[PDB]
Design brief:
This is part of a larger assembly, with chains A (173 residues), B (129 residues), C (227 residues), D (60 residues), E (93 residues) and F (143 residues).
Chain D lengths: L24 E4 L7 E4 L1 H6 L3 E2 L6 E2 L1
Antiparallel strand pairs in D: 1-2, 3-4
Chain E lengths: L1 E9 L4 E9 L8 H12 L6 E8 L5 E8 L3 H7 L2 H7 L4
Antiparallel strand pairs in E: 1-2, 2-4, 3-4
Chain F lengths: L10 H12 L3 H8 L1 H5 L7 E13 L7 E9 L5 E5 L14 E6 L16 E6 L2 E2 H6 L6
Parallel strand pairs in F: 3-5
Antiparallel strand pairs in F: 1-2, 1-4, 2-3, 4-5, 5-6
The chains are: A mainly alpha (173), B alpha+beta (129), C alpha+beta (227), D alpha+beta (60), E alpha+beta (93), F alpha+beta (143).
Chain F binds one RNA strand of 166 nucleotides through helix 1, helix 2, strand 4 and strand 5.
Chain lengths: 173, 129, 227, 60, 93, 143
Amino acid sequence: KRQRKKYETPPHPWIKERLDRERVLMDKYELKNKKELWKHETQLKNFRRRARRLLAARGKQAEIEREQLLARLKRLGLLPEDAVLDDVLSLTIEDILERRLQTIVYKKGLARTMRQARQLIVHGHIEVNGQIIRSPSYLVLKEEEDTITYARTSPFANPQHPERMMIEKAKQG
Amino acid sequence: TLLDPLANALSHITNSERVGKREVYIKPASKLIGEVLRVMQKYGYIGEFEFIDDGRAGVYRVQLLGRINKAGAIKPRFPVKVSEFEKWEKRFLPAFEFGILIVSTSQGVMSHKEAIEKGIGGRLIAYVY
Amino acid sequence: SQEWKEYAKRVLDEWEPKTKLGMMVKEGQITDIHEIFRRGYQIKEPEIIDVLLPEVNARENQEVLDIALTVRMTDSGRRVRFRVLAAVGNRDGYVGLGIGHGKEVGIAIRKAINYAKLNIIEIKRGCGSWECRCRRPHSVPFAVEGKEGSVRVRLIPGPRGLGLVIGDVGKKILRLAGVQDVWSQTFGETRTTVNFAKAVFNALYNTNRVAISPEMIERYGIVVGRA
Amino acid sequence: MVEMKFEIPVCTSCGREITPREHATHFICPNCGEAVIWRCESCRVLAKPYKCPNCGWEGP
Amino acid sequence: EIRIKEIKENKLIGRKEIYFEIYHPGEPTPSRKDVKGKLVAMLDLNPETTVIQYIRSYFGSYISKGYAKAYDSKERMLYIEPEYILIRDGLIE
Amino acid sequence: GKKAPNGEFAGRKLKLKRKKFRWSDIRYKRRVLRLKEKSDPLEGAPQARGIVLEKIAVEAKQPNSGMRKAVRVQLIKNGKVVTAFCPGDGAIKFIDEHDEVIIEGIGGPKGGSMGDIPGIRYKVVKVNRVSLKELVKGRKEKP
RNA sequence: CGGCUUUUCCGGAGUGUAAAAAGCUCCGGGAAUAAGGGCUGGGCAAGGCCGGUGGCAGCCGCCGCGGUAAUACCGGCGGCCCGAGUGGUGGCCACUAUUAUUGGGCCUAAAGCGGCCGUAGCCGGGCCCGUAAGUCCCUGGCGAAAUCCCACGGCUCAACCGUGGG
């Protein structure tokens, strides 16, 4: 046995439609490589395959797996608390990308621009539930979402950090 | 030589439907054929069906309601368990629960849906949709 | 919408009707597109259909599938001609295909557009998948087959958001028809895009042909025409 | 979004529905004058007989 | 700041196992001597009989995990404990 | 007629028929008999080391016209002699008699001759443990 | 142009070794401070100008370009893809319904034996009684672990590992 990549490369690299769509997603969300996007899309496809297999299965094990799948998806915040097994097929990549650490902190207004958010996360200025995490590609659970704050020892815990008032003004502006 | 009455009967039914004939006569009126004719009638594909005492093998008379896209006989009578239905059902029904398969089981020749409801395996004999 | 009615008003004010179908669409008697289809009438004035379906005039809803250059040889030159395979369809289950001959590309495109307008057909849509079963017209209601040339195309219902699993030509054809997901299986030469497009059109048209019981309509939420 | 579920014509001689681009025909009953018979192309070309549902009148 | 999360007494061995957190926000990882001298205070142990096994600093965490032992007689460590840990704690030259 | 056999209890003839007509395929037939492994001068090596014997110009197939430079190489692995193309522009100057060259496949259809050049099968990659690509580019220097 | 962070570098402290080693983690000084590879006629469509070579040099996965303005050779400019990677060669699978049980063909494209008999093999009319071998359902022992999938938990997340289910 050898371990295997968790992401699936696209079947054809030079399709104009996919190229432009991925480019738009890249520019909006500003990932470093298409590798991250492909990893996220592979996660999406995994969830969709699980839903497909479960929808056609009868048995106690199928029910337990279905409940667990819905529980995890709700835990991620990707679905409402009254979600069913049908709408999961309607999930898109953008739902996942909205749940990214970088996307969440930027939506939490701690960065003027999400690239600056990526820098802050990398340099360890952003803590999750009091614990730091240096992967912007990390996926943030719903429960974690309210505990996202600046790292305590980092200067950004200081309200007077010169970049901090610019951050807060751009948030206000 | 007539190796099988059932497949011939179903082929005749389909060919009659396609042109649009009103009444169909099945020459080797076997018991299994009669049990078969009961099934899709119970599911409304056909109307009344009757037996005729011909003195050779009898003849089965049916009238066509124009509601049978295609009917045939799954020939090598594959034994199927309760869980393996969707495998064969994906092979012979155009869509999900579109049409019915017919299974010869311990409790008789009878519809695949009810067999799932009874949870009993058997041997596929024919398909129609 | 309001723009579409505005164009309907313009083409009503201009187009004098000739055929028999023209008046009871210029007189307000007919209001549904499928009112043409149900009675088995015929269409030879494209101006009729856009009066009921102005959405054709959108640029996105009209596709050019192929441009081909056919060479009629002659004793004093290789006189060429453009054949345009085009498809015009709204995104609510009505679509048509056409082939236009032209001395120039532009005239070929115009004639192809008109012929695709005249070959408009209604469509059945549903959720026949063994997985989705959502009772919404995202896919075909059931497995169907179309044939043309050596091309045989079997469309099978596919789960929601799968994406059109078919070649690009069929991708465009099913895109303009208001259908979103499908499994495809092709046999023969798919390279000749004209025959492939015709086979897909045959499959979509055959979608109507199947006999249907009232229960399965509620089962699959079948939509015939406009969703 | 009110559903405009129409009524697809159904040919009397067979009971099948009529495809949009078929060369079927609809006509008032030539005997009773009350019922409109629909007749699809498959029935028409083969000229298999049709029966009126009102007076029972029959005719190819 | 030291917060003990577990104190297990191994009656068979005669030792108190000590599992603890140390809060050192914005500070280096504390030295062994300082943590030993702080630990002995509120538990009233003999420094010679007490040995600190490990002090692991979790990544990006200002709370460090520490594990130590506190025996009863001076012979138990010599007979039982690895010779190297005392050398780390300096109880052996 | 209909495809046969189809009986429930005719597994043997089905299997035997499939085995019988699988040999008619050429890919599977080649793989099982390992014919390439018997015929390969490289004996299954994607890359091989050899010694140049001489330099030859070969005419490209019509309608193309050109004088393609290449080198005959005596293989160290088994002694058999094969001809290898020299890619790049003017690369033949860098190559000399009695030069330790490293060659690989040329990439033609079925691993055969590529492009308009017929009969050739291999191209020269390295010479004296220095790569031809840089030498034609001139970035590195031959020893 | 102004402001800001600390990837690296230096020091200390822990673990660390049963020994350093890992520089692993924490704190401290301090600085903008590690980036290429291939392609750029079409099949790949992803990308257009300039100079040189001129049936030569050459390129080319295949189709093809070069016989003097070369969007295809070479070089410059510009552009496209991927990226701490990226190209060249060889093998297996898919591509391929070109191995066809699902699911290929056999009049003219490769393929019906020239025909007939018949052993084995394969496939076989209808009704009723019987056995229950195949078959279908239930049920007990069994098919090592790891590896597969899933939820939860530990290493910052993950990779990895434990717990529970299949």
